[PDB]
Amino acid sequence: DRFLREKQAKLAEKIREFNDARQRGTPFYICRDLADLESKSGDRHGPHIVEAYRAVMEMVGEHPDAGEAPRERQFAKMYLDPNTQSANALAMRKQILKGATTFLEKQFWNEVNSLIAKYPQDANLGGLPDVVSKIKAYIRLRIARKTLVPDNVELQQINGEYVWAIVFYLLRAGFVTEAAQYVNSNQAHFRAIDRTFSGYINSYASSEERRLKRQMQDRCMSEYNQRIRNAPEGSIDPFRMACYKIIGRCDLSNRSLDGLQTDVNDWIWLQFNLARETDRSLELAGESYGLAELQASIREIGLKHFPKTAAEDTNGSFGMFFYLQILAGMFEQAIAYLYPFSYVDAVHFAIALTYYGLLRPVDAASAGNELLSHNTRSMPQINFGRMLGYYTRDFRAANPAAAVDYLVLICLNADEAAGGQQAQAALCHEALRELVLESREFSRLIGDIRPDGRRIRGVIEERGPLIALDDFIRTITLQAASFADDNGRTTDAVLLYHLAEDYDTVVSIVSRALSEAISLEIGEDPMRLIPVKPRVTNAEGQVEEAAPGSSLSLAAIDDPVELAKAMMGMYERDHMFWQKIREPNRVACSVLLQMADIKSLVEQGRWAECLDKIRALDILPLTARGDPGTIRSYAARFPSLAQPVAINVPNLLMWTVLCCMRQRERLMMDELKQMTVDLMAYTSQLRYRLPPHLHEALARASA
């Protein structure tokens, strides 16, 4: 769980680099990279998954040392073609076999070189050692180790060289041409021991299909039956049999290397080497062995030799079977088989494959299936969408950016090839929508605000190109905004409603939060708001390109007054926002700000100023001395006043009255005491629109 948490971290960042590369057009090698990470994490099943990755590399054409890599989903159209009897299908099947056969030849060839490099003086090669020369050296070293053959078997020799061993191990290493031309370099010597073989191997090396001419195939098969199949034991060089099995595909019913010293990799190689696909409607029973039969073989080996659950596993052998299923292009089954043993590896390997288009996804209509299901055509499907979303719920709460990287990968299957082109893109949207509503990181996901009101694009809309992205971001903002205004999260609501360009609503929200703060008595603790989540988490020991004050998010605003000033500040400086705010609304907030200031003066202890700013409001009749008539003029204005303003008139009085009575304390005095009681007339005339018993508290503070 701890070493795992680290593994998930390094992988998550690679998936970050991955998406940056896809968007910018930078060369990227997903399989090569994912393999490197897996080889450095030291799992027991590691090496098998590393091998599988590299097998897919050879299959797909991911060659970093040549700056060559296939385009995004280059095989989707080919692999996802439902018509199993199409040109696309036949080509896809061929490439799997070719890739696996090629990979398994390279695998062996590397061993040959390693063994030679381990014994240089013994190898004794010339100035420009050719492959044939290296193979002979490899045979020599095997001989010295007594690991070339099983005892009691004598091999045909020529000048001290086991000619058949040399031919076989050249075919084993994929050097078919060099095998044929080695025989041709020794025509006479081969003519003496086998007059027909040269003809067969030359025909074998001259074609793309690695097949013999029909006429030759008949002759080779007959000969193999009459002179080799049922011959006295030890009457035939074990390697010669092997060469015939390979060259002539003799005895496909027994795909094994009995007389030879072989391991599991030699067996696997033989299976792919002998496999052939055909465009012909029919094949002879004795020549019928392609990928379908090969896959069927691997399938049965799984049930018989390997575990399905993690409780049945012990030493990490499940990796071998996953590896086999990959070679065979049983991709959906391979991933489904691995998930229980290592869901992390399963998830990322599925990403690697889906990127190239080698993983059949469920359609959107059946997006509620278990990991592995089958479609109408009985073909295996992986629920890529759900698998990802499910995977991100191990860290989306404490790392929403990483979660966005994965959810975006859902749109890999959202192209013309997948079939459900736009339905898969819709799934990705909902996955991201449920992420935004579930988290409070709006400054990160949707965007932040600069002092002048300009938006700082969020992570999601920057990944727009990678998810078919207009109104989606605008939509999820409005709902996330309404959800915040209704649930009393004032700061989030202001952030979101501004991003949605609903500036008028923003003013109403700050007016309300500011109105509530003004109402509280002078003495209570100041009203505090929960600040929006910061857009960046600058850290100890780390650098902060994002300095405080550069955005609303990094302003740490938790005071309704400071909030109102900030938003009203930018809205009034730029006429663009201003004209989009209703006059009564903007004017109301302005009045509230004055009120908050008037309140600050009282709580501070400045009487002279209080009176002035209150007089400046021109809401109360405070220039009248005893005038009965003018009072009415203002009483009729009350209903016109905005709610959030009117609701604090009761508070104003208590301030205006208290301050005036204090002013009496420090003609002028008589006049001040006059208005003081004049307010007490203001209330009365409109007493059934203020609190019930304000007088008694008012007159009290009035001595």
């Binding site: 019913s253 094994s256 052998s317």
Partner: peptide
């Protein structure tokens, strides 16, 4: 049958080598 019987021999032997 021979190929199937042979595969069993190679993988059984391989498993025991773990």
């Amino acid at each position: 049958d021979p190929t199937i019987a042979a595969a069993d021999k190679i993988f059984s032997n391989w498993l025991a080598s773990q």
